[PDB]
Subunit: 446 residues, 3 copies
């Protein structure tokens, strides 16, 4: 499964076992709730049974009215999308004349139908709740039969269950301005969402993937309010569809790499800034700089190409030889020699500088390693916690073998006299350019 | 309505049709809920009916006890406010010297009153729910009368219905350390919120705006737990008051602009960094750099002046002539020749460099444009998606005319040999000055 | 009543000193178990409303069980990367092993609290907070099979949905969060359950009293991790904060940009301290929190997380009293961006007013009572209620406490605008002096030659 390599030379680590599930595009469905506009109830009197049904009908009638009022490091390199552009684009089409009537007619006999909208796009539609028929054909008839003092108390409770979902939906949208993420259990129950996946135009491998991770799918989905014309409430559900699946993926962890002299100043530091998730797709490598935004379950990675850059395969060369000519690896430089630790998939990188106390501890044995100054690594095999200064990090206990690639720290090849100490997004070649400009200009004057 | 102007020379676009709704200050109201403190019911029984009221009384009593325990790019330029300082200042006034009795007696005859507090501040107070009369004078008498075994299952259900709102209010406060935003429908029902707007000392133009956008109003509001002394639960509701309405607003979109030469390295880049929302305000320009925090409904923009800078009107010149001397436009420079796209209101900016495949497609026609190297623009008229590398962007489909301003790319005026390639918040004049300073060391020393 | 604040005109910053520490230093993990019966498919034919509710509820419960089974299967950049739930998950991984539940299940059959040693050697406390099995299997279903699914008394169905309700919310929270919840809700751990868990935690009475009086903050620093529902047990891990540093001095540093105040629109020079945030001394060094948002304040106590800190030498305070001191090189950033702004402190407001901006401080009764000139100034929250900087209206904190004005000449006046390096995001006073010295030498040495 998962493995890990720590490169001592550039103070970074690569975890390799993972598999992709990249969100590549969107699927939009139209969800409808058929609900009825009720005429004024003539049930006077405060008989205890009566007050409950009148109160419940009133909660429903207000909820409809409430709904009517409501309808009226390198992250900076990424670029700016519009998360709900697709679903909103579908939502606006539903406003056109007799589009609801088409949807309404399509779901008249079943609860699922494919409708060709006026713009030509065919979308799945679902009737997930039928309060129109329940109220008009079961509840109100029982009220007239029993003259509003219901003999059988269970029918009012049967209504209260049906009505709660419409009340929770109207409560959520009252607070979200009609666009929510993740999509709630009231908007789409778990069984409904699983059912939409079976009917989506994707391979069984994709259907099986989504069905086994509905909670991830749910979190990557949007719920867009659309209309309440006629007797219908309609909102668009925007689902992620994963167009790239099961390609190899790897995560890069990076930490500052500094010289190890104890004197307070005069230390110089260097950090790889390309930390994040890498997944090769379609002959290229997709890079996700904010690895927090990617969600991992088992050994499969769900990222979103909205948060990616599309890079040449040669990026991989930065891990093995940072100075290679084929790709200019991104680095940052400073004189701030602060101690910290980065917990990786299968261990921990410890950048220990200055006078910091740095230790690795076992749950049973106590402290079992004290670090020297510099960037080092420890496997999660014998180690349970790592303590850097006053910070105690627990280590990941995911199983897998890690291997330490010894090497001379890269920072030793720079002398502090010509080293450019404020560069936030420089490269291997860019630092050399500033060194040669600085090494010639100072030398030439003498 | 809305329009959009794309400037090819500086690789940016401006969306212009919008109208402002700026949060300018706060309005604080006190919401009170009347509660009865219940003593431990000495009600034993293994009847399913009795167990139901006992569970409900216990659920209510714990909520009271739960509430009792509760008593004890250019974003960095912005500056730091204290969001709920106004509401907290009101809440603190409620803890001292029995101020609740004043509210409690003021709300004795109606459910709405204006109270002048110890500090002199007059605040609206509202009694939104009277659970005391139900519990102490209808329910518990029935319990002691029928020896805790309620005959009618409806009496227990009415209780759990009456009891429900207090339980959710206490839930929200339990999970948010007594400060919630947005303000929920349990905190303030939709009908209650519309009524408070009518009672606020603001214009009908302000009242009409808030009333038609409660879902935004709720999102810009805070609900602050204050006290539960003397059979009263009180919390402060902090509502936004919109002091600037209907002034022109425009959003600036920017993307990196790089040279298009074939050499893989040695390419140069330049990006405008003042992206964000600008709303003309009181003779100046209020700038909101983090456009996520602003909310747009139809063609109306709700922003928060807490997240703004107040700038001279001359800011606008960065859109028309970036090199003018009167205002120093902010930029960043690099050699990081990466491809990306920025989706605008009415189209998409495509920054396509290197060997990346960049295309814009229509839902019916397929691919309809292949982009060349450089920063270009596309209207959302015929285009539905834009694809940059392995990233597929859907374009915004709002109607409006977008307009293309031809121009020579600004970055071509620099030679790559003296270009300062790592400037994170530089300006037009600051970059010119570092080249000018670097041009001096060469000319005077070399010809020497 | 020990909260105070000092404003340093010299470097346009302010320090709030009265506070007390409560740092999360590590984690305590317990396993919470709920006893469940797996309900097999009911054979209820009939459309009587009573049957309709019973069947509706039984299917509602079965969905939750099925749903839960699906679940088993400035200076922030310097901080470093933790794994927040690595500890809780490590416990959760062990519970997946064959028959680890039986160890748990037998330990809690006679009481509701027991310590179980797992396969990996870890002894962890386990708690049974709810027994839904006995109601369903020995009270509800027997009545169903006896009365041929036609329930006589509607009270038993309302009894059921109430018994069933908590498990339904627990499964909802997990279903929407991919099995990891924070803060830990009252459905995950009721208020009395948590207070009881605190008593059994391996901590001092100072720690128990601290956590017991701030459960709502404890909840905000806790995680709840779904693990298993095998063989009539639902188990999830609750990850609780244990506060290893308590009642040590803490102070908040507020900083603002400091610029020259000349009338010329351009050509101004600026300078800002970047070490704003919360500071707490603990083990003879100073734990620094640059992201003051992650720290929560209740009255005079600061709840922070050592995961979001840097550990710095005690010499950091030297930056507050004499920024040019030799023992620590204070971090600052430099710019030419002459923008007006305001930073509200604990006991007042810093007003950095530059250019032509209208800057004002007002009282609720008197109206406008002070207009600021160009430069860095300060105002106490005593007489002042609001502060207006340009078109932004700031309300000031009204916490009681004395603030004091440390008069001094702004540091920015000691630099000449001609040699000032104006693009530095994390340089130091000495690093900038060195850039002045390298540039002052090239100009001085060239004139001699
Ligand atoms: Zn940890
Ligand atoms: Zn030029
Ligand atoms: Zn129990």
């Amino acid at each position: 499964n998962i493995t890990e390599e720590f490169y001592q030379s550039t103070c970074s680590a690569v975890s390799k076992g993972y598999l992709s599930a990249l969100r590549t595009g969107w699927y939009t469905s139209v969800i409808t709730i058929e609900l009825s506009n009720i005429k004024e109830n003539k049930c006077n009197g405060t008989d205890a049974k009566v007050k409950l049904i009148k109160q419940e009908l009133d909660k429903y009638k207000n909820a409809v009215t409430e709904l009517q009022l409501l309808m009226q490091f390198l992250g900076f390199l990424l670029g700016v999308g519009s998360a709900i552009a697709s679903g909103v684009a579908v939502s606006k089409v539903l406003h056109l004349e007799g589009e609801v009537n088409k949807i309404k007619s399509a779901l008249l006999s079943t609860n699922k139908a494919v409708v060709s909208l006026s713009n030509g796009v065919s979308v799945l539609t679902s009737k997930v709740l039928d309060l129109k028929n329940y109220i008009d054909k079961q509840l109100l008839p029982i009220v007239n039969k029993q003259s509003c003092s219901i003999s059988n108390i269970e029918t009012v409770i049967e209504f209260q269950q049906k009505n709660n979902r419409l009340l929770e939906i109207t409560r959520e949208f009252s607070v979200n301005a009609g666009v929510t993420t993740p999509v709630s259990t009231y908007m789409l129950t778990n069984s409904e969402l699983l059912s939409l996946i079976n009917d989506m135009p994707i391979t069984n491998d994709q259907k099986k993937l989504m069905s086994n991770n509905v909670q991830i799918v749910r979190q990557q989905s949007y719920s867009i309010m659309s209309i309440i014309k006629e007797e219908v409430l309609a909102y668009v559900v925007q689902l992620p569809l994963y167009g790239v699946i099961d390609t190899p993926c790897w995560k890069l962890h990076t930490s500052p790499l500094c010289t190890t002299n104890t004197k307070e100043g005069s230390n110089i530091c260097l950090t790889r800034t390309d930390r994040g998730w890498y997944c090769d797709n379609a002959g290229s490598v997709s890079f996700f700089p904010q690895a927090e935004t990617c969600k991992v379950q088992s050994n499969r990675v769900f990222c979103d190409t909205m948060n990616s850059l599309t890079l040449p395969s040669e990026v991989n060369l930065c891990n093995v030889d940072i100075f290679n000519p084929k790709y200019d690896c991104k680095i940052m430089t400073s004189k701030t020699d602060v101690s910290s630790s980065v917990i990786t998939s299968l261990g921990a990188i410890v950048s220990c500088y200055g006078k910091t106390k740095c230790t690795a501890s076992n749950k049973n044995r106590g402290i079992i390693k004290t670090f020297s100054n510099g960037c080092d690594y420890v496997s999660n095999k014998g180690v349970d916690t790592v303590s850097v200064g006053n910070t105690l990090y627990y280590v990941n206990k995911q199983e897998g073998k890690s291997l330490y690639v010894k090497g001379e720290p890269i920072i030793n090849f720079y002398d502090p006299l010509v080293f450019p100490s404020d560069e936030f997004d420089a490269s291997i070649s860019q630092v050399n350019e500033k060194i040669n400009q600085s090494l010639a200009f100072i030398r030439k004057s003498d």
